[PDB]
């Protein structure tokens, strides 16, 4: 009689059909990604076409249920997730034009090539070539040339295409009752119909601005320290007060400052923690690595692992006969089939990466009983954060000593922890202003607040005012340098990283408080505690059928993002760094530029 029950029957049918269809699609992806042939490409194309056709058919068939007549939350969430037609609301002509422009974005970004001005036939791609150029070479001229060649080759091609991309996305968002594409992206954190847990679309902007305001001083102190080190290295290129050049930040866009570590190492003479010698000495292999991480996960009381993962997943590079793309990814094929793929090497980095991947598998397996439409994290930012917190836990020297990789005679001191915290800051503190400003700038572009003819100008003004980065050579409006990034040119949100950074440290603080640890936050270990495992499971089982605020409160007790764990973890780092910055200027001037003399 009622429409709710018909919706229940429809979702019951959809779940059982989509389980099998998604399993076949993901199995095709799994047999292609590890094992690269030409027929596997066809098999995946067929499976993906069937999956997309099924999704479109289900959306069209279930659009006839209005959401105003649903009561219990479980169903309303399923139907809201199903009903989002996305690009199908737009007319077919503009939709296909949009898919072609997306394909050209992918092709230009992936096949983008730059040639040295001395050899026309010698050209380099980005990841194979320019990545290494700006990650290893200390030459100023070479880094400048890599930056300028890459940007002048991609942005001029990508500018008008990005313009029409923004126009079409804004039109589609306005079709779907959204003011702009920024609002469509922000709708991920949206929830309604739950008292005491509501969240608005501008609330995200407000809280992210407030969090950046409270996190600003540590970033400015780290900027002062990095600038001092850079003028020590490069006296004739960097002003004592002006902003740092873009191509001196360790990577292609200034995303991460992990490379600059050697420049800002406090005690180059103090030994660094590395146990690759321990693995080669003990003849450690991939299987023992994953068994060690298995027992690490068992230590907190998490559910112990299944057979099929060990039997069928490839834990090693499949030789040279078969070539594999082994970026670290955890695959949930559905119906209880969990799999891993990465070319495992005997390195500590691979140890932490394996711990991260197992964390993703643990999350994926935790909500296996949840229906098909909801088997995902409370929001987008809970998967990676849960994967990274385990790697953070495993990186503690206490765990290494416990598991017999680090000698007990190793003497922990203040300098070693200062070095480790500077490493963590260079990987984490550097990227927060970049993520915030990049996502925010795109939001204004989507809002259309910034006219076409000053996008680049306003972008660089924001960068010099808030990030302390100034371009070395001036650019006009014909460039599309933001599109020179993987996430910008290929339709991905970027704020995910800021929220992940907040969430992982909130979780770390909560679990460490539950673990009864008497020592520095960075020395905290979460093993030995089945209470911590139970606390983690209390949210692991939830999925996203409930608001993300409730899931976050189930771990930390807070209903909103807070910055206290991040400042508490870096407090000794903050006080040491402010001790250093007494003899250096704090802040940056937006007027100074390398090309202005």
């Amino acid at each position: 009689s009622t429409i709710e029950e018909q919706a229940k029957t429809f979702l019951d049918k959809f779940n059982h059909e989509a389980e099998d269809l998604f399993y076949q699609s993901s199995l095709a992806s799994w047999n292609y990604n590890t094992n690269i042939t030409e027929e596997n490409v066809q098999n995946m194309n067929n499976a993906g076409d069937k999956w997309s056709a099924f999704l479109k058919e289900q959306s069209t068939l279930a659009q006839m249920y209005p959401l105003q007549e649903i009561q219990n939350l479980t169903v309303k969430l399923q139907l809201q997730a199903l009903q989002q037609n996305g690009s199908s609301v737009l007319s077919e002509d503009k939709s296909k034009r949009l898919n072609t422009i997306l394909n050209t974005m992918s092709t230009i970004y992936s096949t983008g090539k730059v040639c040295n001005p001395d050899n026309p036939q010698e050209c380099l791609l980005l990841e194979p070539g320019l990545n290494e150029i700006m990650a290893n070479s200390l030459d100023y001229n070479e880094r400048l040339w890599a930056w300028e060649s890459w940007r002048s080759e991609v942005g001029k091609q990508l500018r008008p295409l990005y313009e029409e991309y923004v126009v079409l996305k804004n039109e589609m968002a306005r079709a779907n009752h959204y003011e702009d594409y920024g609002d469509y992206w922000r709708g991920d954190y949206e929830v309604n119909g739950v008292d005491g847990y509501d969240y608005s679309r501008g609330q995200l902007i407000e809280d992210v601005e407030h969090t950046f305001e409270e996190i600003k001083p540590l970033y400015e102190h780290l900027h002062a320290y990095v600038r001092a080190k850079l003028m020590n290295a490069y006296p004739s290129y960097i002003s004592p007060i002006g902003c740092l050049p873009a191509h001196l930040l360790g990577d292609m866009w200034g995303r991460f400052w992990t490379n600059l570590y050697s420049l800002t190492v406090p005690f180059g003479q103090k030994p660094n923690i590395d146990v690759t010698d321990a693995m080669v000495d003990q003849a450690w292999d991939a299987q023992r690595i994953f068994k060690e991480a298995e027992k690490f996960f068992v230590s907190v009381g998490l559910p112990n692992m299944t057979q099929g993962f060990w039997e069928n997943s490839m834990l090693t590079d499949p030789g040279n006969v078969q070539k594999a793309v082994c970026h670290p990814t955890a695959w949930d094929l559905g119906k209880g089939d969990f799999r891993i793929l990465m070319c495992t090497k005997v390195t500590m980095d691979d140890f932490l990466t394996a711990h991260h991947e197992m964390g993703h598998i643990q999350y994926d397996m935790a909500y296996a009983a949840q229906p098909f439409l909801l088997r995902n994290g409370a929001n987008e930012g809970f998967h990676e954060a849960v994967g990274e917190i385990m790697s953070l836990s495993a990186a503690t020297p206490k765990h290494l000593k416990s598991i017999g990789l680090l000698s007990p005679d190793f003497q922990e001191d203040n300098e070693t922890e200062i070095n480790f915290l500077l490493k963590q800051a260079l990987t984490i503190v550097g990227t927060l202003p970049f993520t915030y400003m990049l996502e925010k700038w795109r939001w204004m572009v989507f809002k259309g607040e910034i006219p076409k003819d000053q996008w680049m100008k306003k972008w660089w003004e924001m960068k010099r005012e808030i990030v302390g980065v100034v371009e070395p050579v001036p650019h006009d409006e014909t460039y599309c340098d933001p599109a020179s990034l993987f996430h910008v040119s290929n339709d991905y949100s970027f704020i995910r990283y800021y929220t992940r950074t907040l969430y992982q440290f909130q979780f770390q603080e909560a679990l460490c408080q539950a673990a009864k640890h008497e020592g520095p936050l960075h020395k905290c270990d979460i093993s030995n505690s089945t209470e911590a495992g139970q606390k983690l499971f209390n949210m692991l089982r939830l999925g996203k059928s409930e608001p993300w605020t409730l899931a976050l409160e189930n771990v930390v007790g807070a209903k909103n993002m807070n910055v206290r764990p991040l400042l508490n973890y870096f407090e000794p780092l903050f006080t040491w760094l402010k001790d250093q910055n007494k003899n250096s200027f704090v802040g940056w001037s937006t007027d100074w530029s390398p090309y202005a003399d």
Binding site: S1, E5, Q6, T9, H16, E19, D20, Y23, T306, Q307, G308, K335, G336, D337, F338, A368, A369
Partner: protein
């Protein structure tokens, strides 16, 4: 637990179960029903929008959780009613 004989890759689509019936069943009853359900008002014919086929499938694969694992169940029933017993336990004794 039967995880070696009653399990297969590519999904096992042979075992059934029923989720829809007009009322409650009576003890020790067999009902191979083929009729289509009815919600409360429609003179529906066939698989109507409110009239569904009341049979589902036990999708089985050997990579399932223990709680969802396809357990093999057999029940043994006895009757303690006054009548000539034909089946009884064995017993054996000593030497002469």
């Amino acid at each position: 637990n039967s995880n070696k004989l009653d399990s297969k890759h590519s999904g096992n689509y042979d075992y059934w179960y029923r989720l829809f019936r007009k009322s409650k069943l009576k003890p020790f009853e067999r009902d191979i029903s083929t009729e289509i359900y009815q919600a409360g008002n429609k003179p529906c014919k066939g698989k109507g929008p409110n009239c569904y086929f009341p049979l589902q499938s036990y999708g089985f694969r050997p990579t399932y959780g223990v709680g969802h694992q396809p357990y093999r169940v057999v029940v043994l029933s006895f009757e303690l009613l006054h009548a000539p017993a034909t089946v009884c336990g064995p017993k054996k004794s000593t030497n002469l």
